Design a protein around this ligand. Structure first.
Ligand SMILES: CCCCCCCCCCCCCCCCCC(=O)OC[C@H](CO[C@@H]1O[C@H](CO[C@H]2O[C@H](CO)[C@H](O)[C@H](O)[C@H]2O)[C@H](O)[C@H](O)[C@H]1O)OC(=O)CCCCCCCCCCCCCCCCC
Ligand SMILES: CCCCCCCCCCCCCCCCCC(=O)OC[C@H](CO[C@@H]1O[C@H](CO[C@H]2O[C@H](CO)[C@H](O)[C@H](O)[C@H]2O)[C@H](O)[C@H](O)[C@H]1O)OC(=O)CCCCCCCCCCCCCCCCC
Ligand SMILES: CCCCCCCCCCCCCCCCCC(=O)OC[C@H](CO[C@@H]1O[C@H](CO)[C@H](O)[C@H](O)[C@H]1O)OC(=O)CCCCCCCCCCCCCCCCC
Ligand SMILES: CCCCCCCCCCCCCCCCCC(=O)OC[C@H](CO[C@@H]1O[C@H](CO)[C@H](O)[C@H](O)[C@H]1O)OC(=O)CCCCCCCCCCCCCCCCC
Ligand SMILES: CCCCCCCCCCCCCCCCCC(=O)OC[C@H](CO[C@@H]1O[C@H](CO)[C@H](O)[C@H](O)[C@H]1O)OC(=O)CCCCCCCCCCCCCCCCC
Ligand SMILES: CCCCCCCCCCCCCCCC(=O)OC[C@H](CO[C@@H]1O[C@H](CS(=O)(=O)O)[C@@H](O)[C@H](O)[C@H]1O)OC(=O)CCCCCCCCCCCCCCC
Ligand SMILES: CCCCCCCCCCCCCCCC(=O)OC[C@H](CO[C@@H]1O[C@H](CS(=O)(=O)O)[C@@H](O)[C@H](O)[C@H]1O)OC(=O)CCCCCCCCCCCCCCC
Ligand SMILES: CCCCCCCCCCCCCCCCCC(=O)OC[C@H](CO)OC(=O)CCCCCCCCCCCCCCCCC
Ligand SMILES: CC(C)CCC[C@@H](C)[C@H]1CC[C@H]2[C@@H]3CC=C4C[C@@H](OC(=O)CCC(=O)O)CC[C@]4(C)[C@H]3CC[C@]12C
Ligand SMILES: CC(C)CCC[C@@H](C)[C@H]1CC[C@H]2[C@@H]3CC=C4C[C@@H](OC(=O)CCC(=O)O)CC[C@]4(C)[C@H]3CC[C@]12C
Lengths: 406, 40, 75, 189, 390, 239, 15, 49, 24, 101
């Protein structure tokens, strides 16, 4: 009947395990019922129509002259914008256009209260926001994509290489990075990666598309685990499984080979594909968009792990997080494909610096700041449920009491 | 530009055909512009 | 319960006056009028519209971005 | 810090409405009377710059009154009778005679106060000697001018005297006195 | 715990040497008291009006009896009759104060929160205590139980190091603070040191310690004591003069403070209970389970105090109502048996608390008498003075 | 000009502040009664300044501090004249409360009269409460505290100089006349100290406006409202 | 038996 | 309909002037009826009365 | 919506004054 | 002249009070009612009923419990002229119609 000096610890373990399980289940409860809503949100938002704005100023306006003010949800707005103001559009294959538009739309729509731009001295003053091989010193001030015509075969320059990057910081993510590259021989790459801050226990999100002459030759998407055992939390595995059952069903199960280099960083549910026709590509695209959106929405409610004086478990957790992110960075650096397509065009002393400082940098002693602008939500609120000051109350009781005589 | 445009669309704007019969900014839009200039 | 406070910025009523009456005045009648309105109220072509709306929005976004920059940041 | 979002390095002190109209433009800080009609500095300025005379009159008399000088309270409906006697029930000739007398009195009082201020300057210049024990014999002209314009509270004077007596240090001055706000109670006053 | 692995013989000789019945073994680290709330049957949390009205009416009857007697024989009675009526009134009020402490933690009548707030305020006022401040100090105590340098709302012990520092500053053992400590923790007045607690509430009457959003609630809390001491303590005096004050108010007040102080002091202090600093091995569950002592009284006293001695159960299940505290303890004693400590209120216990355990030294991590400790650290003062030769 | 620019900047500053305060009040109300959209964090009600004005102030101040740097306490003797966050007349109020209470109890025990202790302890309770509220002078309770203390000291002065004290009766008639002694003098000094430090809060409580105040006002709705309240709702507004 | 269990679990979470 | 709006003011001044003072309109003392040739101005006066 | 105030009482006639001397 | 202008812009409420409200609507009706009830024997037609008619005719509105005229009439007239004998009438003739003695 009495208890033992050990089974107390058994009780502690069981309690914290049931707590973790409960919260992980609560996280998936939202996607579980209807997974299709992770890709079909734009179509539904379009279906519901343009909302009418009811704020005192707009009501007074549309009553005075005629002018009705209309609004649109965030999904429709980021669908109207599209590949908004990228300077290298008009050169991008429509598939890469679609994917970039969707990914940046989810960033701007979900993280909008804390999304900042990465510090400008780290990438944007070195001239890394738009890179051209025919002008490696920026003596045309970044208009080389328009001033210099494409070199013909055999001339000094063939083939030309162009890159464009965008880097953001946020509250949970220390870096959200999207980069597009074009080469004259008919090659186009797209590379997206999302790193959580050094104090959050989340996997790293990653996507790569490589298409040649309009045909997608390689496509890989995965949530690379960050722990030492290559094991995600329960809810990440559950969501990936549910989404693969939803979108990828009826497609190739044997084409999902695992690259030799990913075998040390990939999760057991990574997706690598050389698509066959249009249906495979459509399935993969829907799946990638849905997976990204689910990942961001589950990040919306993350809490850091803090190291308390005396606690060793949290120190161990922090060290494991740091080492997992570093392992990902150093094992991505030897993906020799992009490395060589860079270095055979821009040199090597440039390539090493660029790949070290921007693509896969890892310095735990520096993570960029952010700017929390949540107070904005107050202002918007109080412009549609306003309050009028103590003298409109008399006028309104007069209006009611005199109108109610009918 | 992309960010401020997304916000302005989701706030509200006078459609060209709805209006039959913006020289200055409202106050919510001024909060939004100041913040966007501070972040980006 | 009940709060008597005016959470509206007067600059907005002034902006609306300028708009509708130069292209009555700022008194209590205007504010109670807006309260009356709010109370009684709360009781192919797709792509063409996309192009039109994108153009219209980007116009004014750029106009105000340059205004703000020149006035409050060049200094 | 309380500030959830934004906090500069110096905490924000909530400033409130002013409760009294500023000293006019014609007055000085001291006790000696003003100038009957036109100030003396007006003669050393451009004719198109002396419009601030009448503008200040307009501001104090009609357009900038702080809503705290317009409170209706039980004290003010009796002060109304005092003032209405002085303005409508007394002939302007007797008021003029009283005005002349009061001017002469204020000139005598100002002369006395200036004498006292100079005396205080010697006294504290002497006290700084005890304080430093050795050489220091000067005083502070800043403190003399601040004493003449009534810009010190009595506590500041006492603390300055003590600082002088203990460590010399004639150039360490108390901060400055802030103006007294208008006292209000309720419907009462 | 201080007495780690060792046979039952030394445990029991320590037990009957210090007056405890069952000493405690050793609890594992890394836990929390809220764990063992799962060992409790769910029927213990049920509300019933019977025990409620009984708990609010028995101490009221004892108080009324004492007062009726005392007034029937106002000042013609000798001092022992006065002492006995004062003791009875003080105990009755300690019972009503336990009820008020229950209403402060929101676990007496949760269905009517306004009524239980008003009741707690009313019952706390006559002792000149505030309800919101009491809630705050008690929560802060539960969060920091036995934490060295942090549990300021409990019987924080006088450590050797701060005493040595004060003796180095005083230049001898004759200063004012010295003699103050000397009489406060060497004489039976220690059994009233709770009055010091009373003065440390009213945190300077300073609204700058609290969160602004609560000012109006804190101010109201301070106005119920004051109103009492502003409307009722006059009447008493005016209607009975100094004597009619010292027998109708001051003696029950001193008795109530005796009860408060002895309860708390016995609860969380014993030679085998260490006071670990923060970061240096302080554990929450270890301090709330192993570092607690349960006092046993005669059942008449218990039913008069509303089971005010049973403190361990309501630290593992903070919502457990007052009338289920005895029963619940019997449950925990079955499962947490080997780790608990228990004692019976006897003269030996209080004599030990007064004469023996006075200073807490952390190197030996135990309590030692004040006089031997001070003369020892003074001999080491002489020896460091000899070490100060050059 | 560079003069109308200053006026414009001050108008914008003041309007932004007034609107932030109205939002805070209305949000406190809507939150205390349930109706709030659950992304709302009740700590946003402790930000007093405004987000916009705070950002402007921060930027300007950092620009200044950047481009410009291209008993007795010997270290700072003037510590009493430093904004510590309370009212200046806060320890005097508690001191006077303690004096009143002690003196009242001592007197009423030494003689047998029951008015000294009642008045002394009543005033002591009220003045201790006021001196507790006066420990944060920016709030609304920080101002109601000053008002309460002034009221109590004025009542003490009145009872002393107009009715006198019961335990001070004599056999004669001019020997027992109500005069000002030492308690009334201390209370009068306190009242003067409250008035000459700060008692300017809650200035919007007065007698309501007349039809005489709104004769020249530029508002027809407001004038009509006032006329209605005072009993002239039927008069013709030839304005 | 629920009004006390609610309070119990809330206080436990906080603590 | 536009003058429906414009003359629901005269109607409400005739029924209930206190409500029309709350809208910023002190008094309506004299109105003009202009328009195109031959609009039948006598007809609407009947209706409003 | 009114206040608690008397009404004028002499806008119609003057007879009321006849009570002030007589009572006096 | 300037001093008068400044003072007149700060004293509009008190000016209207002393010019239009002090006598006509505060002191005159009080004096009138007290003076009427000083004369005029302790009847009922004279203490309550006739003042009601004359006040209604003079002021132009019937006094109801919402107005101070009703309460002044009530207190002075009724409570100090008609009550001290209607009380005896009731205490002699209507309490025996109930149980209490
Ligand atoms: C002693 C000298 C008195 C000489 C005299 O003639 O004394 C009489 C004076 C009244 O004097 C009148 O005083 C008048 C004052 O007018 C002046 O003041 C007026 C306003 O007061 C007007 O402004 C008028 O224009 C301006 O000239 C004129 O001087 C009259 O001629 C003169 O009769 O009374 C008084 O001394 C004042 C009465 C005080 C009595 C107590
Ligand atoms: C402790 C000090 C007691 C004391 O002094 O207290 C006496 C008074 C305050 O006592 C008040 O005293 C009042 C009566 O005072 C009068 O009576 C007193 C003696 O009865 C003195 O004469 C005093 O000057 C005079 O004002 C009433 O009894 C109040 O109930 C009692 O509180 O303090 C004082 O004189 C005021 C102290 C001077 C301010 C420095
Ligand atoms: C009744 C049952 C009610 C149910 C509620 C039970 C809840 C139990 C919680 C109560 C907690 C009580 C804590 C008691 C406590 O803090 O006191 C114990 C505290 C000791 O505590 C330590 O005291 C130190 C002294 O500064 C420091 O303050 C430490 O921070 C403080 O922890 O008592 C003191 O403060 C002693 C010094 C004060 C001197 C005593 C004055 C004696 C005056 C004589 C009185 C007249 C005698 C005739
Ligand atoms: C002469 C005594 C010193 C003057 C004094 O009252 O200090 C008054 C100072 C004033 O106190 C400070 O005043 C400043 C003036 O701007 C600020 O307002 C601060 O808020 C206020 O705290 O308070 C003291 O520190 C009093 C300490 C001694 C209390 C006397 C007890 C009797
Ligand atoms: C004598 C009447 C006192 C009024 C003198 C005011 C002097 C003054 O302003 O000092 C200067 C300071 C006031 O300080 C003012 O404070 C303001 C903020 O409120 C600003 O800081 C102003 O700059 C500063 O002038 O006075 C004190 O600090 C408090 C002095 C208290 C003196 C009261 C004495 C009466 C007490 C008698 C009661 C005895 C009970 C025991
Ligand atoms: C029954 C009376 C009950 C009240 C008890 C008195 C409370 C104590 C005194 C009140 C504080 C004084 C306020 C103040 O000084 O105002 C400024 C006032 C003018 O009142 C001001 O006058 C102003 C108009 S003007 O200056 O007169 O032109 C006006 O703006 C303002 O509202 C009006 O207050 O200036 C005075 O000179 C007042 C001195 C009279 C003091 C004697 C008090 C008698 C006791
Ligand atoms: C029935 C109801 C009865 C009610 C009973 C109520 C009794 C309680 C009141 C009893 C009297 C209280 C007086 C306390 C005075 C005091 O402690 O001031 C506290 C101040 C600090 O002030 C402070 O200084 C602080 C800054 S600092 O850190 O201290 O420097 C600052 O926070 C603060 O604003 C400032 O005030 O202490 C001082 O710095 C040294 C004292 C300087 C003046 C000496 C006068 C003391 C009496 C001399 C004889
Ligand atoms: C000039 C005014 C100076 C005298 C003030 C009136 C005396 C009040 C004392 C009456 C009294 O001793 O009180 C006692 C008395 C009953 O014995 O009270 C009553 O019932 C009195 C009720 C009668 C009311 C008297 C009204 C006439 C006042 C004269 C106005 C003519 C002035 C117009 C100019
Ligand atoms: C007089 C009897 C009959 C009624 C009970 C009176 C109590 C309500 C009073 C008397 C003792 C007072 C306390 C005495 C000491 C202090 C400290 C004092 O603050 C300080 O001393 C602050 C720190 C410092 O001064 O250094 C004011 C609050 C407090 C708790 C007082 C609060 C009000 C108390 C409890
Ligand atoms: C000149 C000295 C001797 C005395 C001054 C008297 C006036 C200042 C008082 C006496 C009668 C008062 C009136 C009596 C009745 C009322 C109704 C009452 O109305 C309110 O409840 C207004 C408060 C609000 O809701 O805003 C208080 C204001 C008012 C008009 C009072 C305004 C101030 C008056 C004129």
């Amino acid at each position: 009947s009495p208890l033992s000096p050990e089974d107390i610890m058994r009780l502690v373990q069981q309690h914290e395990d049931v707590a973790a399980a409960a919260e992980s289940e609560q996280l998936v409860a939202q996607f579980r019922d209807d997974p299709q809503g992770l890709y079909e949100y734009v179509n539904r938002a379009y279906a519901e129509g343009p909302r009418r704005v009811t704020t005192p100023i707009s009501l007074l306006q549309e009553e005075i002259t005629g002018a009705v003010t209309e609004s649109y949800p965030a999904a429709v707005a980021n669908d109207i914008i599209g590949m908004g103001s990228w300077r290298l559009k008009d050169d991008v294959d429509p598939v890469i256009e679609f994917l970039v538009a969707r990914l940046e739309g989810c960033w701007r729509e979900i993280l909008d209260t804390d999304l900042c731009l990465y510090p400008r001295e780290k990438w944007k003053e070195q001239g890394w926001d738009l890179v051209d091989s025919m002008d490696p010193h920026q003596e045309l001030e970044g208009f080389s994509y328009a001033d210099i015509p494409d070199p013909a075969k055999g001339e000094a320059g063939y083939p030309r290489l162009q890159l464009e990057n965008r880097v953001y910081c946020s509250k949970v993510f220390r870096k959200l990075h999207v980069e597009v590259g074009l080469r004259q021989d008919g090659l186009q790459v797209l590379h997206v990666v999302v790193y959580p801050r050094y104090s959050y226990d989340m996997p790293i999100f990653g996507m790569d598309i490589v298409m040649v002459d309009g045909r997608v030759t390689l496509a890989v998407v995965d949530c690379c685990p960050v722990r030492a055992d290559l094991k995600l939390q329960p809810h990440y595995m559950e969501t990936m499984a549910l989404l693969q059952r939803t979108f990828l069903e009826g497609t190739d199960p044997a084409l999902r080979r695992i690259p030799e280099w990913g075998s040390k960083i990939f999760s057991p549910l990574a997706l690598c594909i050389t698509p066959s026709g249009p249906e495979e590509l459509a399935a993969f695209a829907k799946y990638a968009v849905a997976l990204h959106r689910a990942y961001l929405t589950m990040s919306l409610n993350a809490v850091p792990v803090v190291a308390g004086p005396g606690d060793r478990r949290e120190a161990a957790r922090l060290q494991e997080i740091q080492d997992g992110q570093k392992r990902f960075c150093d094992n991505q650096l030897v993906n020799k494909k992009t490395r060589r397509v860079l270095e055979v065009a821009m040199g090597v002393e440039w390539t090493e610096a660029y790949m070290s400082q921007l693509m896969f940098d890892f310095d735990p002693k520096y993570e960029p700041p952010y700017f929390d602008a949540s107070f904005e939500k107050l202002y918007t609120y109080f412009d549609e449920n306003p309050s009028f000051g103590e003298m409109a109350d008399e006028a309104m009781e007069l209006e009611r009491g005199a109108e109610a005589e009918r | 530009l992309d960010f401020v445009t997304n916000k302005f669309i989701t706030l509200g704007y006078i459609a060209p055909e709805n209006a039959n019969l913006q020289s200055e900014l409202l106050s919510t839009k001024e909060i939004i512009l100041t913040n966007s200039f501070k972040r980006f | 319960k009940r709060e008597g406070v005016l959470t509206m910025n007067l600059k907005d009523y002034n902006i609306l006056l300028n708009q509708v009456y130069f292209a009555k005045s700022l008194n209590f009648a205007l504010i109670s009028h807006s309260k009356k309105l709010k109370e009684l109220n709360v009781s192919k072509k797709s792509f063409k519209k996309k192009y039109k709306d994108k153009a219209i929005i980007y116009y004014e976004v750029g106009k105000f971005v340059l205004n703000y920059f020149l006035n409050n940041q060049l200094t | 810090t309380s500030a959830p979002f934004i906090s500069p390095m110096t905490p924000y002190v909530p400033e409130e409405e002013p409760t009294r109209t500023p000293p006019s433009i014609k007055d000085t800080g001291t006790l000696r009377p003003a100038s009957e009609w036109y100030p003396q500095w007006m003669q050393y300025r451009r004719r198109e710059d002396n419009y601030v005379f009448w503008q200040d009159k307009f501001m104090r008399c009609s357009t900038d009154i702080p809503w705290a000088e317009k409170r209706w309270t039980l004290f003010s409906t009796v002060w109304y009778l005092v003032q209405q006697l002085r303005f409508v029930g007394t002939p302007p000739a007797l008021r003029y005679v009283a005005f002349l007398g009061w001017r002469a009195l204020m000139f005598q009082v100002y002369a006395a106060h200036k004498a006292l201020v100079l005396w205080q300057c010697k006294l504290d210049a002497g006290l700084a000697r005890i304080g430093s024990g050795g050489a220091t014999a000067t005083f502070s002209k800043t403190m003399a001018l601040r004493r003449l314009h009534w810009r010190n509270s009595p506590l500041a004077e006492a603390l300055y005297a003590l600082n002088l007596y203990k460590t010399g240090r004639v150039h360490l001055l108390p901060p400055v006195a802030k103006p007294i706000p208008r006292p209000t109670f309720f419907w009462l006053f | 715990t201080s007495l780690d692995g060792l046979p039952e013989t030394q445990k029991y000789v320590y037990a009957d040497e210090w007056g405890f019945s069952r000493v405690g073994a050793d609890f594992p680290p890394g836990s929390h008291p809220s764990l063992f709330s799962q060992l409790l049957p769910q029927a213990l949390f049920a509300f019933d009006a019977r025990a409620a009205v009984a708990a609010v009416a028995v101490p009221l009857a004892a108080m009324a009896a004492g007062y009726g007697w005392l007034w029937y024989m106002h000042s013609i009675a000798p001092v022992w009759q006065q002492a006995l009526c004062a003791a009875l009134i003080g105990t009755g009020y300690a019972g009503l104060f336990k009820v008020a402490h229950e209403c402060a933690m929101m676990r007496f009548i949760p269905q009517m929160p306004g009524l239980q707030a008003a009741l707690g305020t009313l019952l706390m006022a006559p002792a000149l205590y505030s309800l919101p401040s009491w809630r705050l100090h008690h929560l802060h105590h539960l969060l920091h139980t036995n934490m060295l340098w942090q549990d300021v709302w409990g019987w924080h012990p006088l450590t050797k190091v701060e005493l040595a520092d004060e003796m180095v500053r005083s230049g001898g053992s004759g200063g004012a603070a010295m003699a103050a400590a000397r009489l406060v923790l060497t004489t039976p007045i220690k059994l009233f040191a709770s009055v010091g607690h009373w003065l440390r509430s009213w945190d300077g009457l300073d609204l700058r310690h609290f969160h602004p959003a609560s000012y109006v609630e804190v101010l109201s809390g301070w106005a119920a004591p004051l109103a009492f001491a502003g409307l009722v303590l006059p009447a008493v005096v005016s209607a009975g003069g100094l004597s009619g004050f010292v027998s109708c108010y001051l003696a029950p007040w001193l008795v109530f403070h005796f009860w408060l102080s002895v309860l708390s002091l016995t609860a969380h202090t014993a030679p085998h209970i260490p006071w670990r600093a923060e970061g240096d091995g302080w554990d929450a569950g270890r301090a709330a389970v192993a570092g607690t002592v349960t006092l046993r009284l005669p059942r008449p006293l218990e039913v008069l105090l509303n089971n005010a001695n049973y403190m361990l159960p309501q630290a593992v299940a903070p919502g457990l109502p007052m009338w289920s505290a005895p029963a619940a303890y019997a449950v925990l004693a079955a499962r947490l048996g080997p780790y608990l400590t228990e004692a019976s209120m006897s003269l030996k216990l209080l004599t030990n608390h007064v004469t023996r355990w006075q200073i807490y030294d952390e190197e030996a991590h135990t309590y030692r008498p004040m006089e031997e400790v001070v003369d020892e650290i003074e001999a080491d003062l002489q020896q460091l003075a000899a070490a100060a030769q050059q | 000009g560079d003069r109308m620019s200053r006026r414009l900047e001050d108008i914008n500053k003041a309007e932004r502040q007034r609107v932030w305060d109205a939002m805070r009040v209305a949000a406190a109300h809507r939150y205390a009664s349930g109706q709030m959209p659950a992304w709302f964090d009740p700590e946003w009600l402790q930000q007093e300044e405004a987000p916009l004005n705070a950002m402007d102030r921060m930027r300007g101040e950092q620009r200044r501090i950047e481009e410009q740097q291209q008993w007795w306490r010997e270290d700072d003797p003037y510590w009493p004249l430093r904004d510590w966050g309370d009212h200046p007349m806060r320890w005097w109020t508690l001191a006077f409360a303690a004096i009143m209470a002690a003196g009242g109890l001592a007197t009423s025990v030494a003689t047998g009269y029951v008015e000294p202790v009642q008045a002394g302890l009543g005033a002591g309770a009220l003045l201790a409460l006021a001196g507790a509220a006066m420990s944060d002078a920016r709030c609304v309770p920080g101002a109601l505290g000053v008002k309460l203390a002034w009221a109590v000291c004025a009542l003490i002065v009145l009872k002393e100089v107009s009715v006198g004290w019961q335990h001070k009766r004599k056999r004669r008639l001019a020997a027992s006349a109500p005069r000002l002694e030492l308690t009334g003098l201390a209370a009068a000094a306190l009242c003067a100290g409250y008035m000459l430090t700060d008692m300017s809060g809650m200035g919007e409580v007065a007698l309501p406006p007349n039809p005489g105040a709104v004769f020249k006002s530029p508002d027809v709705a407001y004038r009509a409202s006032v006329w209605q309240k005072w009993g002239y709702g039927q008069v013709q507004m030839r304005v | 038996t629920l009004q006390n269990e609610r309070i119990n679990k809330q206080l436990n979470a906080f603590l | 309909d536009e003058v429906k709006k414009e003359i629901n003011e005269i109607i409400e001044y005739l029924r209930n002037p206190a409500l029309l003072r709350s809208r910023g309109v002190a008094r309506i003392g004299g109105v003009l009826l202009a328009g195109a040739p031959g609009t039948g101005k006598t007809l609407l006066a009947k209706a409003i009365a | 919506s009114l206040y608690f105030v008397f009404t004028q009482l002499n806008q119609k006639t003057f007879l009321s004054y006849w009570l002030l001397p007589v009572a006096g | 002249g300037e001093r008068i202008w400044a003072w007149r812009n700060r004293s509009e409420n008190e000016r209207w009070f002393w010019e239009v409200f002090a006598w006509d609507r505060l002191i005159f009706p009080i004096l009138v009612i007290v003076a009427w009830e000083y004369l005029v024997p302790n009847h009922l037609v004279w203490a309550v009923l006739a003042p009601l008619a004359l006040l209604t005719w003079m002021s132009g509105r019937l006094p109801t419990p919402a107005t101070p005229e009703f309460w002044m009439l009530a207190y002075f007239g009724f409570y100090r002229k008609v009550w001290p004998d209607a009380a005896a009438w009731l205490q002699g003739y209507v309490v025996p119609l109930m149980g209490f003695a």
